[PDB]
């Protein structure tokens, strides 16, 4: 099945998931000079004060920090979005080296990693139904670069030892995702897809301009995770990113000048 290896990586995904070559695939390169300021975009509303994290899971391609999305507790609205989108999970993509790891790029620049906070449109009732709709999901993407430590990430880093291998999960309550946001909410937005199979074209992408900084020790612990299950040969979980896909008939809008 699909992964990020030489024989099952992004260049092979189209064989099982033909939409891999579709008209609104993600991620993409963000050409900053071509993105147009759109004054009709509203400010983004990130309301995570009542967020309820539950669990952290190594699913064999990343780790997801999962939230209780059975009520409006952590929601995204405004910006390009109509209606209310509930936080279901966040995860990261990252590299084997600091010079790569992000899925989106900015004028071809790759960051060390990229955070995805995944939200689904409540008008569709559940996540399974939402992914079947062109406006079913809103993903907030945040770049990571390596420098000073991010304090609000440390809690995540320190639980990774307990979910080293595929299929392992651990209780992860009372985590506050506000600790992962940069200072500025300036963003680019465009219509796109999930960046993992099934690659459904159901996402409004909201990519923040300002990266967060994490420490070399922080990213080094992320790179100790495994793609494999326990008792299987160790393959380090690194370079779990899909490269940039053709923009085709899409415009990237900026929230800022
Ligand atoms: Zn992702």
Per-domain boundaries in the chain: 1-257
Tell me, in angstroms, the distance from the centre of ligand 1 to residue 11's CA.
17
Phi-psi region of 45 (alpha: psi -120 to 50; beta: other; left: phi over 0): beta
In this structure, how many other beta carbons lie within 10 angstroms of the beta carbon of residue 51?
Answer: 18
Closest CA to 212 of 128, 111, 124: 111
Is 69:88 a contact under the CB 8 Å cutoff? yes
Residue partners of 115: CB distance under 8 A and separation at least 6 = 90, 91, 92, 141, 142, 143, 144, 180, 212
The response to whether 119 counts as a known ligand-binding position is no
User: What span, in angstroms and rounded, lies between the C-alpha atoms of 19 and 163?
Assistant: 32
Closest CA to 139 of 212, 200, 78, 90: 90
Closest CA to 222 of 157, 155, 144, 141: 157
The listed CATH number (3.40.50.300, 3.10.200.10, 3.40.50.970, 3.90.79.10) that belongs to domain 1-257: 3.10.200.10
Residue partners of 17: CB distance under 8 A and separation at least 6 = 2, 197, 198, 199
Tell me, in angstroms, the distance from the centre of ligand 1 to residue 231's CA.
27
Read off the tokens for 57: 């899971």
User: What span, in angstroms and rounded, lies between the C-alpha atoms of 106 and 27?
Assistant: 11
Residues near ligand 1 ion, CB 5 Å cutoff: 116
| 61: annotated active-site residue | yes
User: What span, in angstroms and rounded, lies between the C-alpha atoms of 199 and 90?
Assistant: 17
Is 245:104 a contact under the CB 8 Å cutoff? no
Closest CA to 120 of 67, 171, 181: 67
Beta pairing, strands 137-146 & 203-208: parallel
Burial of 182 (0-12, 13-18, 19+ CB in 10 A): middle
Closest CA to 27 of 194, 250, 145, 188: 194
Read off the tokens for 155: 């809690």
The response to whether 91 counts as a known ligand-binding position is yes
Q: Write phi, then psi, for 204 (nearest 5 degrees).
A: -85, 115
Residue partners of 149: CB distance under 8 A and separation at least 6 = 213, 214, 215, 217, 218
Name the experiment that determined this structure.
X-ray
The response to whether 12 counts as a known ligand-binding position is no
Q: Which residue has the tokens 């690194």?
A: 238
In this structure, how many other beta carbons lie within 10 angstroms of the beta carbon of residue 39?
Answer: 8
Closest CA to 247 of 186, 193, 185: 193
Between vectors from CA 229 to CA 224 and to CA 232, what angle results, nearest 5°?
Answer: 95
The response to whether 1 counts as a known ligand-binding position is no
First to last CA, the chain: 43
Distances (CA, A) of 88 to 25, 149, 195: 21, 26, 16
Tell me, in angstroms, the distance from the centre of ligand 1 to residue 192's CA.
12
Cα 149 to the chain's mean position, in Å? 20
User: What span, in angstroms and rounded, lies between the C-alpha atoms of 64 and 179?
Assistant: 16
**Catalytic member of 33, 61, 104, 119:** 61
User: What span, in angstroms and rounded, lies between the C-alpha atoms of 125 and 197?
Assistant: 22
In this structure, how many other beta carbons lie within 10 angstroms of the beta carbon of residue 184?
Answer: 11
Tell me, in angstroms, the distance from the centre of ligand 1 to residue 115's CA.
7
3-state SS string over the chain? Answer: CCCCCCCCCHHHHHHHCHHHHCCCCCCCEECCCCCEECCCCCCEEEECCCCCEEEEEECCCCEEEEECCCCCCCEEEECCCCCCEEEEEEEEEECCCCCCCCCCEECCECCCEEEEEEEEEHHHCCHHHHCCCCCCEEEEEEEEEECCCCHHHHHHHHHHHHHCCCCCEEECCCCCHHHHCCCCCCEEEEEECCCCCCCCCCEEEEEECCCEEECHHHHHHHCCCECCCCCCCCCECCCCCCCCCCCCCCCCEECCC
Tell me, in angstroms, the distance from the centre of ligand 1 to residue 246's CA.
18
């Amino acid at each position: 099945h699909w992964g990020y290896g030489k024989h099952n990586g992004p260049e092979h995904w189209h064989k099982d998931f033909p939409i891999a070559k579709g008209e609104r695939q993600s991620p993409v390169d963000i050409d900053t000079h071509t993105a147009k300021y759109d004054p009709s975009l509203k400010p983004l509303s990130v309301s995570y004060d009542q967020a309820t994290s539950l669990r952290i899971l190594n699913n064999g391609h990343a780790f997801n920090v999962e939230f209780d999305d059975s009520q409006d507790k952590a929601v995204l609205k405004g910006g390009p979005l109509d209606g209310t989108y509930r936080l279901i999970q966040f995860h990261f993509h990252w590299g084997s080296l600091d010079g790569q790891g992000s899925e989106h790029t900015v004028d071809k620049k790759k960051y060390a990693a990229e955070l995805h906070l995944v939200h689904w449109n409540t008008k569709y009732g559940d996540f399974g139904k939402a992914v079947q709709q062109p406006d079913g999901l809103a993903v907030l993407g945040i770049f990571l670069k390596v420098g000073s430590a991010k304090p609000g990430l440390q809690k995540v880093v320190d639980v990774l030892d307990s979910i080293k291998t595929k299929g392992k999960s651990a209780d992860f309550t009372n985590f506050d995702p506000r600790g992962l946001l940069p200072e500025s909410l300036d963003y680019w937005t465009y219509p796109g897809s999930l960046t993992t199979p099934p690659l459904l074209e159901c996402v409004t992408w909201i990519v923040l301009k300002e990266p967060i900084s994490v420490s070399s020790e922080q990213v080094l612990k992320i790179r100790k995770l495994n793609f494999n299950g326990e008792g299987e040969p160790e393959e380090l979980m690194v370079d779990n990113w899909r490269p940039a896909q053709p923009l085709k008939n899409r415009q990237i809008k900026a929230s800022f000048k």
